[PDB]
């Protein structure tokens, strides 16, 4: 299947409680593999997946140096953004950035990403052509002109088309026993009476990887989109994910309802019914 | 692996 | 400008009384990132609780997994207590083994 690598930066100011905290985490697909935290006793980029541990000391030194430099520059960026919005020194603010590459089964670049948000609001994004930016407002226009003068887009294009996909390909091979292994959901339907007239049918998917999954209820083969309660896909803690979908059915009519499950780990899609 | 250290916003 | 947390409390494996398991409290969809999350056993704060590294979704909201080892019984009650700037008072969500 297709794959992605993403890094997530978060910088958080906290006036009166020290300098802004800087966090970086890296993912391949839905597997976290590195973390950096400027609040740590000895800040270093650290492994969070077994297949990255084999990288040598020059790898960990480079990622740590970049992240320590980022701690300083994202603190300056937070000061800059505060001024762009005429904001006081007393409030706490958040700067977030996420970037990375998507590749297809041949490992070729499908598209690159770099976008930033300030206090949860989209701020600036590298366009899909990897050559220009979309600035959300007149503050982000200042950043855009800075980055244009520094030739930033050309640096991003070179990373996203080059080292990003090269490192992702290496990670996929080093971690192929997990990163390239799709674990199918274990599925079942439970039944929960509400009253004499109604009951809940809940269709469960457990233990699956990656997190992408489709869970739907049909009644007489018609999708019950508006009437299905879908919880957010949630982590189990063992790399796998869980999800369920629920519908309220008239008592006695349970057999008109079917649960349909799609996942990359499944040879063929699944149709499930309440067993009784 | 990370892109090189960022320049300021 | 602020987003209130979604909360799910659940176990890693299907719960069977007397069998060791993991109790999970998954907080997501919230902004800003400061959050207080406690796991409760019959109303008391469980001491040893770990959590995942702070990350965020495509819509910029943050998510965290808090988890501890536990052994469910028939009588014991478990819950997750969450405090966030969006919450006038902490929010308690009880563990229901059917959800």
UniProtKB/TrEMBL annotation, chain A:
<keyword id="KW-0812">Transmembrane</keyword>
<dbReference type="GO" id="GO:0030670">
    <property type="term" value="C:phagocytic vesicle membrane"/>
</dbReference>
<keyword id="KW-0490">MHC I</keyword>
<dbReference type="GO" id="GO:0031901">
    <property type="term" value="C:early endosome membrane"/>
</dbReference>
<protein>
    <submittedName>
        <fullName>MHC class I antigen</fullName>
    </submittedName>
</protein>
<keyword id="KW-0472">Membrane</keyword>
<dbReference type="GO" id="GO:0002474">
    <property type="term" value="P:antigen processing and presentation of peptide antigen via MHC class I"/>
</dbReference>
<dbReference type="GO" id="GO:0042612">
    <property type="term" value="C:MHC class I protein complex"/>
</dbReference>
<dbReference type="GO" id="GO:0055038">
    <property type="term" value="C:recycling endosome membrane"/>
</dbReference>
<comment type="similarity">
    <text>Belongs to the MHC class I family.</text>
</comment>
<dbReference type="GO" id="GO:0012507">
    <property type="term" value="C:ER to Golgi transport vesicle membrane"/>
</dbReference>
<dbReference type="GO" id="GO:0098553">
    <property type="term" value="C:lumenal side of endoplasmic reticulum membrane"/>
</dbReference>
<keyword id="KW-0391">Immunity</keyword>
<feature type="domain" description="Ig-like">
    <location>
        <begin position="185"/>
        <end position="271"/>
    </location>
</feature>
<keyword id="KW-0732">Signal</keyword>
<keyword id="KW-0325">Glycoprotein</keyword>
<feature type="disulfide bond">
    <location>
        <begin position="101"/>
        <end position="164"/>
    </location>
</feature>
<keyword id="KW-1133">Transmembrane helix</keyword>
<dbReference type="GO" id="GO:0000139">
    <property type="term" value="C:Golgi membrane"/>
</dbReference>
<keyword id="KW-1015">Disulfide bond</keyword>
<feature type="disulfide bond">
    <location>
        <begin position="203"/>
        <end position="259"/>
    </location>
</feature>
